[PDB]
């Protein structure tokens, strides 16, 4: 994808990569996402009517308490100057996808009816680094009851590639008995 939100996030990652603050910058970017969730905080930055000069002063105070990285504080200042603060949320989310690309890591999603153990997670991570080529592999879990018993993982560059065996047995048997 190449949209304005994606374009900005990619720049932010590239500067971190140059300066070797990829771990350090990523923590700050995660820290920002908590900040901009709040409807009141996001609204103040986003709306055109509030004066830009006031926005910087408030932003500086926010940066100090936060203790953000020197570029990360710039990056928000750049967004504010160039009017694209209305799409901060898209930009922040976009950065995570870019950050995985730079490391060479991959992300996976595995879902189950009941919570499961760590060795299963490590072996799914093994299989996903096999079929994907993660330099390293990463994993996430979301407990959903409306399946039968299985696990579904979800991976790829987007949340695209899906394999599972819980209810796909049953829906598959409906669609195979119509044959």
């Amino acid at each position: 994808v190449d949209s304005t939100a994606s374009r900005y996030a990619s720049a932010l990652a590239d500067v971190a990569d140059v300066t070797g603050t990829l771990e350090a910058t990523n923590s700050d970017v995660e820290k920002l996402i908590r900040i901009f969730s709040e409807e009141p905080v996001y609204y103040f930055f986003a709306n055109p009517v509030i004066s830009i000069d006031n926005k910087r002063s408030v932003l500086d105070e926010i940066i100090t308490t936060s203790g953000l990285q020197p570029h990360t504080a710039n990056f928000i200042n750049i967004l504010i100057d160039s009017e694209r603060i209305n799409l901060v949320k898209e930009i922040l989310n976009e950065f995570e996808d870019v950050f995985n690309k730079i490391t060479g890591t991959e992300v996976a999603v595995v879902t189950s009816v009941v919570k499961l153990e760590n060795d299963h997670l490590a072996q799914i991570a093994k299989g996903v680094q096999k079929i994907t080529g993660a330099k390293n592999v990463r994993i996430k879990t979301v407990i959903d009851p409306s399946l039968v018993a299985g696990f579904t993982i979800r991976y790829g560059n987007e949340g695209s590639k899906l394999v599972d065996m819980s209810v796909k047995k049953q829906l598959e048997e409906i669609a195979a008995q119509l044959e």
Partner: protein, 502 residues
């Protein structure tokens, strides 16, 4: 009609030998649904033109593979497709099951039956978007396609492997030119495909009723997408019909295909393209509408003896608007097609039926289509209707002229009575040679115009019964031999004697 004794096995029959294989699919999520389009996030590995399947079972073709999303055009109503719901690419690109057992089945644009007569037993599959034969796979058009109309099969001859265009304004007789062509090959072993894009469902049912009465459905597939259907099904319906006609053509069988309006296919691809935000052109069509119809019609030509000499004679029908031949979709198909059959409503109201405007209508194959018997006789019909075309201004002034001109006005007014056929009364080639030999050689100058129709019907039923040796000369040798020219003249002077008494 016994079920419940064997239901207790069939449930255990599908579970036996069931693979349950885990394989990687490309999943997406639905971003937005509207107007039969689905923008889809994900599907990172989908190929262009691939069928994707939705939740609630709707299938669509991924056409726009854009950088942020995939523009999927739905093959059905997307009313039950929910925002955020999953969607998975199926792995295949637009097939139909293909078989001998489509002959007589009214199927729709995925070649599923809509006649309510059971499934179709099929074992092979053809691609809907198949490529055309190349240059070295073809042969020159040399065999006739007998349509049963004198105005076409004499002067605008359609051969096998030729794409001819039936064109005119609405209610001129375009369907009847195409239907009577299908009704003529009851004895020839061509297979007809009648594709009906965007029509009223009542008129598809009247064509199949016309076909089943006259025994035409023993060699006919009717592909039908009624105007209620989505625009994807109307866009893919002649490609479904052309894929069925390519099946028989590669199995050495000769075929005819009729597209009942290519005009409504172009409007159905303009609908999808404007909803897929593709930039338009003249009459809001995309740039691909030429490449739509040229990819369709070039699949229909005549094959070489290294392949088996199957043919696919396309007769696309295009409707113009107030005779605007220079409109965008008539301009494309006239460029693509070999010949054009121009039908005019000023001849349909005057009684000239089928309303062929034979002056403007052309055929690029030319006389290579016609048989040798037809080349001899229709060499005189073309010249003498051209001499009557220059003298149309003189018909009001027939008295004030010499006999060299006035006989040409008298001859040309009976040569137009040759061309008049009623609907669904196609003539055999032997009956066409009799009619043009009689008219172009002076044997109708004694008759009033009310009787030229009644004379030829009685002379065609005379030689059918009394002189059957004429039909064997033209069926086998296919040449207007000096024997048959003697045998035909004996039939004329005996019929003119019986017709004058009456």
């Amino acid at each position: 009609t016994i079920r419940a004794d064997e239901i207790s096995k069939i449930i255990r029959e599908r579970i036996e030998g069931y693979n349950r294989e885990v394989k990687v699919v490309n999943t997406g999520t639905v971003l937005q649904v509207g107007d039969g389009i689905a923008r889809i996030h994900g599907l990172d590995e989908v190929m262009a033109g691939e069928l994707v399947e939705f939740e609630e079972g709707t299938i669509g073709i991924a056409l726009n593979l854009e950088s942020n999303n995939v523009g999927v055009v739905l093959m059905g109503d997307g009313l039950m497709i929910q925002e955020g719901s999953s969607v998975k690419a199926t792995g295949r690109i637009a097939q139909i099951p293909v078989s001998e057992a489509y002959l007589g089945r009214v199927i729709n644009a995925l070649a599923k039956p809509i006649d309510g007569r059971g499934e179709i037993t099929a074992s092979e599959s053809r691609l809907i978007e198949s490529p055309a034969p190349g240059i070295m796979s073809r042969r020159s058009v040399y065999e006739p396609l007998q349509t049963g109309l004198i105005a076409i099969d004499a002067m605008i001859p359609v051969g096998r492997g030729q794409r001819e265009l039936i064109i005119g304004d609405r209610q001129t007789g375009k369907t009847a030119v195409a239907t009577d062509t299908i009704l003529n090959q009851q004895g020839q072993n061509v297979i007809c495909v009648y594709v009906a894009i965007g029509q009223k469902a009542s008129s598809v049912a009247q064509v199949v009723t016309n076909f089943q009465e006259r025994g035409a459905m023993e060699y006919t597939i009717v592909v039908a997408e009624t105007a209620d259907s989505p625009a994807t099904l109307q866009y893919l319906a002649p490609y479904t019909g052309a894929a069925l006609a390519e099946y028989f053509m590669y199995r050495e069988r000769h075929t005819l295909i009729i597209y009942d309006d290519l005009s409504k296919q172009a409007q159905a691809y303009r609908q999808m393209s404007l909803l897929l935000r593709r930039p338009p052109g003249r009459e809001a069509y995309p740039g691909d509408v030429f490449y739509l119809h040229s990819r369709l019609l070039e699949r229909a030509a005549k094959l070489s003896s290294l392949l088996g000499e199957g043919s696919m004679t396309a007769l696309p029908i295009v409707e113009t608007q107030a005779g605007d031949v220079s409109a965008y979709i008539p301009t494309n198909v006239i460029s693509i097609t070999d010949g054009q059959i121009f039908l005019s409503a000023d001849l349909f109201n005057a009684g000239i039926r089928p309303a062929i405007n034979v002056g403007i209508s052309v055929s690029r194959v030319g006389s290579a289509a016609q048989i040798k018997a037809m080349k001899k006789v229709a060499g005189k019909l073309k010249l003498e209707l051209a001499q009557f075309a220059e003298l149309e201004a003189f018909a009001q002034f027939a008295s004030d002229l010499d006999k060299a001109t006035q006989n040409q006005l008298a001859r040309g007014q009976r040569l137009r009575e040759l061309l008049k056929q009623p609907q669904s009364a196609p003539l055999t080639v032997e009956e066409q040679v009799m009619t043009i030999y009689t008219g172009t050689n002076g044997y109708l100058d004694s008759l009033e115009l009310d009787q030229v129709r009644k004379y030829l019907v009685e002379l065609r039923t005379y030689v059918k019964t009394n002189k059957p040796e004429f039909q064997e000369i033209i069926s086998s040798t296919k040449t207007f031999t000096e024997e048959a020219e003697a045998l035909l003249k004996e039939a004329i002077q005996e019929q003119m004697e019986r017709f004058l008494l009456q």
